[PDB]
Structures are given as structure tokens and as C-alpha cells.
Design a binder for this molecule. Structure first.
Ligand code: PLP
Ligand code: PLP
Lengths: 424, 424
């Protein structure tokens, strides 16, 4: 049914100049992905001219959807004054104040060009502050490609370290993993390494292991352990910040030492941020001699990304936050009803404007739950909707009741088609 | 003489929300840096309203200067169609072809959001391809903050490993350093580690150790060593690419296995690139199963950065390249004449549109060569010119003969003031 000829032609060119025609693993699909030309509001038009509602929003980055007029105005004006400089600008100060105001723990901030960089610098900061080597992270959680955190980062709960080909033992031996939401099992691992732990790195709502929130009992156990041991508690909220108006830890009743942010904080332009209590951030301070931790980067705090951020935060009011949460609750409820009516036990998880369909059974005609979910992803594309290929999705502020209603119709239709094709 | 009151007021706000009021170590100056508001062409206007000629251009990023009208048009149009997407776009393919065309070795490309990320991914690729742990880099050369390369990265030629506080031994033990332009001493180190070397990471024209080019004898020794040992030869040209129309290795008569690029390739928007022969890049290919080296990132290949890149490369013609090289030669000659007339032995190095004044003596009244150069940096600011605080500078394509003439007058004046103030 779908026409993807212009996508296929782009792919044929791409494979000659990129490895497998790809520049970002997560956007690839076999045999080739759909390529897109433009977006407006909640919708994206592919290169074959087909307009669809976007329910993933650049991996949850685009909290204000595509080309929001107020963001476009702010970004284009900044571009016109100069894209980047070898000197700081007024907008970096304005934006640091705006971000710092969102949570009491965000006392001092520094900007990067990506969440990947920000996680790296947060880990480096903890290592510099403590002068200890090890880090603990959640088994299965993703934090980007930096080698110390690219360990057990693919959704598995396995507690044995597992890393990318070529990541040396000298790196891997200094990262250990803990079981999400299991305080007892987590403390067993943490206490074995306490003297040597620089940090405990968490995501409070990690999607790859199911998009369930961290529990109070687990957060409290980790906070107490960090206080007793001197390890720094780092909350990577690059993806999960958006669940709360003051971020994810605050929504769940807890405080990080350092928080890593990105994605929605600029809602489409390259950025990351490290924000935390002054003492932890002091490793970066260059004002009283050489810093313990140098941290540069050509685009850090560039005024285009800062202007995107100012506009994103200004649009992300308490009212807007509440509204996209209500739409998210409605979407999750409708998915659960459709799954139930189709005889499927799959979970629908999420908080606020985030959701994930977690396929946990293989219906007839599919070799695995993951293959059935990939089929649902493709059927949803055919039926006018973009979600993730393992069930992730999200609401954007240009959406209203009609987009969520259209999604519900498409979701039920698509599920029926997936199941019928499997039984055929 | 200089009025910096609006800069001081921005700094007073900044210190409350950033560590030492800073987000990028390299742009800090004591007691505070000059803040800037906008740029146009070759000039930048500070927050106090003072327009100066920019001879550093965001650490050599802005090859086309500030807010070039053709770059602004391309970038603003891209922004209007959507800043980033969870799907590939036509412009990533167009830009990959444009970049790949610049050098025969750039067979397959992948994009990142920074040179820092690109260097990290190049090293990871070499480790994945070879399954060996160690890397060799130049003693003193900078490659960004990634921990494996943030070793001996501050201009010193010392051959003993030296790293940032907190970088663990498990990282540092797998990075060794070699003496720039000393084939004999380099091969002594390399041969000690040959069985375990994933890569030899060079910059062919590293500024922090003097902005002298790699010699043919040294490049040949490294190429031969990599061919014999199986280590990957990685050329980090994030800063030095611009010396040649086909990049730095090609200008100097050599071939890398993988080249890292950034800065001028998009001339102001966040980017990096890893480009190399297909076999080395194959670790990233996701088209025939899971890749050996996953590599994602929310802004990879985003259409704003791709459009900046297309426009930057289209403006960077052979004619434009030759012209900025002629202006660079003229600027370097005028600096040497002024230094000679002032009785100073400082070097002026560089190729093409890059230069660096390398202070190597402490004139009367200065505690060090570095302090005298910092004084020259501040005097040049007072006299209407931005350069780096350790002597780095560069030409941009909006410059012509009048900017280089004004620079020469300011440089001679400033040098006289520095020396007279020291003798007073
Ligand atoms: C997106 C994400 C990252 C990586 O951020 P980029 O900006 O894509 O480099 C890091 N951590 C988590 C938890 C994320 O969701
Ligand atoms: C600029 C530079 C880097 C870092 O690139 P960013 O884009 O600033 O992160 C890496 N290597 C070298 C040699 C550079 O000049």
C-alpha cells in the first residue's frame, strides 16, 4: 500500500557514501527507512509526499513538535546575528538562569552539544571530584555512546558486564550494573565497590527496560548509599526530564547531586546540559586558577541552541505540561483498551506525555514479541502514524484531542492487521 | 581605555548559575571575558557596542565569517522545515556526497554533533575493527574531552602520560604518546606496543605544539608502521582540514585510513564527521544485521547542520581557498616584520589561512612568554582585533586586503604597547 520510491532512491545514493546508507543507528529500518522532507506542528511529510502524525518526535526531543512558529522566529533571529562565537553571549546567561530555575538542585549549569557529551562530562566530573574510578549504572539503561556508559545498554537486565566490541577491559572493568527497582540486589553490588565508586548513574524513567518509574524505596536506598559512601548520585534525565515540570527526580520525590539534561530542553537544536549542586560543579570552575576538569567544545552555549532553549522553556509552561500529560493519559488508556479487545497482554507504560507499548508475547505468525511490535510499527506507518519500532511514543504541545483520536483509530486498525496477517 | 561594563554585568549574573560563570573553558579570560552580541562578515560587535575584526572566528570554525548571507538563507530555510527528525532526510545524502567528494579516502562518512564526538567514534571504530586496546597520539596535541584522548593534550612535548584528575588508570594505561616529527623516537614507542595498538591518532598540523606541519619523513614512518602492524591511521583534521582543498593529509602528500572533521565543514552549526575507507567504516553498517559499533545521537545528520554544511562547502571553492591562503601568507609576513622591528624572536607559523604567533621569550616586565602573549591578546582587543590568547588566528572568506592591512597596523601598535608597558 505504501509508496516509498523516493525514499528508496535516496537510500541507493546513501549506501555509496555512508556505511549501510546510515548516519544514526536508531533511525535505520530494514531494508531502508522512510526519509522525510519537512514537518509542521504535529505532522511530518515524507519524501514521497505522505503526511503523517508524529508520535515519536525525534526520539522524544520535539516537545513542541515541528517548526513551532515561536521557536522558528527565535532560532532564525539568532542565526541572523551569528551562529557561534569564540566569546560568551547574553543568551547563554539568560538560558542558564531559565534552566536553573526549574529545580532547586540545578544550582550551576554547563552546556554541551549533546546529551551524549553531557553524560560523559557528568561522569568525568564525578571522577574528578571523588578521585575514584568506578561507576555503577542500571542494567539495561542507555546513556549514549561514551565508552564508560555503553555497557549493558540495550534493555537486558543481565547483571554481568557486556560491552561493545573493542571497548577495552580497562574501561569495562570500571563500570558495574545494578538491577532497576531492586534495592536489596542493588545494595549488594554497590557495597562490594563502595570504596572505589565515583558515582551511581541512573535514569529515573528508563524506556529501554520498560518505561516504568524508579520506586521510592529504590531511590531512597541509592540516595542513602551515596550519602554514606561519598559516591555522586547522577540522574540522566536527557529523555525522562519531561515527565515532571521540575524534572523526573523531583516528580518521584528525590534529589540528584548532578542531573544530565538534553532533548526537550531545546526541543530540536543540538544541546546537552550538566546541572548540579555547586560543590560538584566546582571541578569545572576556571575563575580561581586552572580548573580540575577542563571542558570546552566549539558549539557549547552557542546562541542558536541557547535561543532554541529559551523559547522551548518559555513555551513549556505548567499549563502546557498538564495538558500534554492529560493527552498522554488518554492515549495510554485507549491503547490498553485496544490491546485488551484484540486479546493481547502487552503492557502500556509511561508517565505524563511519554508512553511505551511493551510487547511481551509473540502472536501467531511472529517469531518473537519484538518482531510483532516491528510489524505494528510498519502498519502504523501505513495508517498515518509514526511511533518507535519497539513501541516508544510521546505527545507534543501542538497536539490536541483530534490527534489522539486519530491515533486511537489507527492503533486499533493496525493491531487488527498485524494479527490477521500473522494468522493468514 | 576599553569599556567592558555590560560584559561585567553579564558575568555577575553568570557566576550565580554557571561554575565560575563559564560554560566552555577555552573562551574564559580573567577576570572575565568580553561578551559579544552579534557578528557580520569579518566583524564582531561586543555587548558594549564595540565592533572589532575577528581573526579567530570561533576557534577557526567560521571559515565564512559571521552570518554570511548565503549560509543564513540556507540555515533559516532548513529551520523553517524542521530542525531535527527521527528519520533521515534528503540533505544528509546531499551533504555526504559533497563531503565525500573532497578526498579520495573519504569513501564512507557518518555525522556527529561535534568534533569531540567524532574523534571518540573514530577511536571506537578502530578498537572495534582491530579488537586491540591501545591508542597512540602525539605528545601535546588536543582532540577534545573524550577520556582516551584527553591525555598529554596541553601543548607539552613530555613523553610520560599525564591526564586529567580522575581519569582512571584503566583509561590512561591504554593511551601512549609519540614525539611530533621525530620518526626515530616515534617508532621506538610504537614498536613497543605494536601488537596491542588499535590506532595511531595524529593531527597533521596541531596548533597547540606550534602549528607546524607534519613532515614527509614522519608521515611516511607512521603510514608504514600502520601498514605493517595493522593499526588504523586516524587523521584528526577537525582544526587542520582547512589548510588544503582536499584536507591536510593530502596537502602533505599522505593518506589516512580514517579522517575526523568538523569546524569549517559546516562553518558555524554543530557538526563532526568520521570519513574513511569502506572497510574501516563497516563497523557502523547496520544493513546486514546488528552493527559491530552502534552509533546514534539525537542531532546526527540533522538538516540544519547538513544545510549549513552544504552551503559552507559550496562557498569553499578552489578560488576562495587560494584567496584566503594569499591573505594568510600576507598576514604572517607582516607579523614577522613587526616582531623583527620590535626586537622579538617569536615565531609566526601556519599554512594557508591559519597562523599562530608562538611567543618563546619573556620581554622585560613579563614573568613568562605566555604572559607576554596574553598581554598582546588584550592590547589587540583594545586596538580592535580578536585573536587567541596564545597567538592563534585565521582568515575568513569575507576578509580582503583592508582587513589584513588594519590587522598589521594594530599588531605593530599593540606590540609596541606591550613592550613599553613592560619596561615602564
Ligand atoms: C537521548 C539520551 C542520551 C543521549 O543524548 P543525545 O543528545 O542523543 O546525544 C543520553 N541519555 C539518555 C537517557 C537519553 O535519553
Ligand atoms: C576543535 C577540535 C576538536 C573538537 O571539536 P569540537 O567540535 O569543538 O568538539 C577535536 N580535534 C581537534 C584537532 C580540534 O581542532
Amino acid at each position: 500500500a505504501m509508496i516509498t520510491e523516493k525514499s528508496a532512491a535516496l537510500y541507493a545514493r546513501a549506501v555509496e557514501v555512508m556505511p549501510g546508507g546510515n548516519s544514526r543507528t536508531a533511525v535505520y529500518s530494514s531494508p531502508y527507512p522512510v526519509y522525510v522532507r519537512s514537518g509542521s506542528g504535529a505532522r511530518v511529510t515524507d519524501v514521497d509526499g505522505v503526511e503523517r502524525i508524529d508520535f515519536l518526535n525525534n526520539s522524544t526531543t520535539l516537545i513542541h513538535g515541528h517548526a513551532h512558529p515561536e521557536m522558528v522566529e527565535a532560532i532564525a533571529a539568532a542565526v541572523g546575528h551569528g551562529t557561534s562565537f569564540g566569546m560568551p553571549t547574553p543568551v547563554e546567561v539568560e538560558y542558564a538562569e531559565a534552566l536553573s530555575a526549574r529545580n532547586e538542585t540545578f544550582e550551576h549549569v554547563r552546556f554541551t552539544s549533546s546529551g551524549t557529551e553531557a553524560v560523559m562530562m557528568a561522569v568525568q566530573a564525578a571522577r574528578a571530584y571523588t578521585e575514584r574510578p568506578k561507576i555503577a549504572k542500571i542494567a539495561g539503561a542507555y546513556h549514549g555512546a561514551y565508552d564508560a556508559v555503553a555497557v549493558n545498554n540495550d534493555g537486558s537486565g543481565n547483571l554481568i558486564s557486556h560491552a561493545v566490541t573493542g571497548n577495552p577491559e580497562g574501561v569495562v572493568a570500571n563500570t558495574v550494573v545494578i538491577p532497576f527497582n531492586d534495592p536489596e540486589g542493588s545494595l549488594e553490588v554497590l557495597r562490594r565497590h563502595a570504596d572505589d565508586l565515583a558515582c551511581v548513574l541512573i535514569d529515573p524513567v528508563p524506556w529501554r527496560i520498560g518505561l516504568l518509574p524508579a520506586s521510592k524505596e529504590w531511590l531512597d536506598a541509592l540516595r542513602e548509599f551515596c550519602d554514606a559512601s561519598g559516591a555522586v548520585l547522577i540522574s540522566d534525565e536527557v529523555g525522562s526530564y519531561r515527565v515532571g515540570y521540575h524534572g523526573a527526580m523531583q516528580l518521584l520525590g528525590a534529589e540528584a547531586d548532578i542531573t544530565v539534561m538534553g532533548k526537550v530542553i531545546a526541543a530540536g537544536m543540538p544541546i546537552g546540559a550538566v546541572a548540579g549542586r555547586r560543590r560538584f560543579m566546582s571541578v569545572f570552575d576556571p575563575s580561581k586558577g586552572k580548573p580540575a576538569l577542563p571542558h570546552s567544545g566549539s558549539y557549547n552555549a552557542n546562541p542558536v541552541s541557547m535561543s532554541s532553549g529559551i523559547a522551548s522553556l518559555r513555551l513549556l509552561t505548567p499549563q502546557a505540561h498538564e495538558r500534554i500529560g492529560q493527552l498522554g493519559e488518554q492515549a495510554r488508556g485507549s491503547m490498553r483498551t485496544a490491546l485488551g479487545e484484540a486479546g493481547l497482554d502487552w503492557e502500556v507504560n509511561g508517565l505524563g506525555s511519554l508512553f511505551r507499548v511493551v510487547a511481551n508475547s509473540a502472536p501467531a505468525g511472529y517469531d518473537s514479541a519484538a518482531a510483532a511490535m516491528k510489524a505494528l510499527y510498519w502498519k502504523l506507518l501505513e495508517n498515518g502514524i509514526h511511533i518507535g519500532d519497539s513501541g516508544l511514543g510521546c505527545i507534543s504541545t501542538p497536539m490536541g484531542e483530534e490527534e489522539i483520536a486519530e491515533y486511537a483509530v489507527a492503533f486499533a486498525k493496525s493491531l487488527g492487521q498485524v494479527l490477521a496477517e500473522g494468522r493468514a
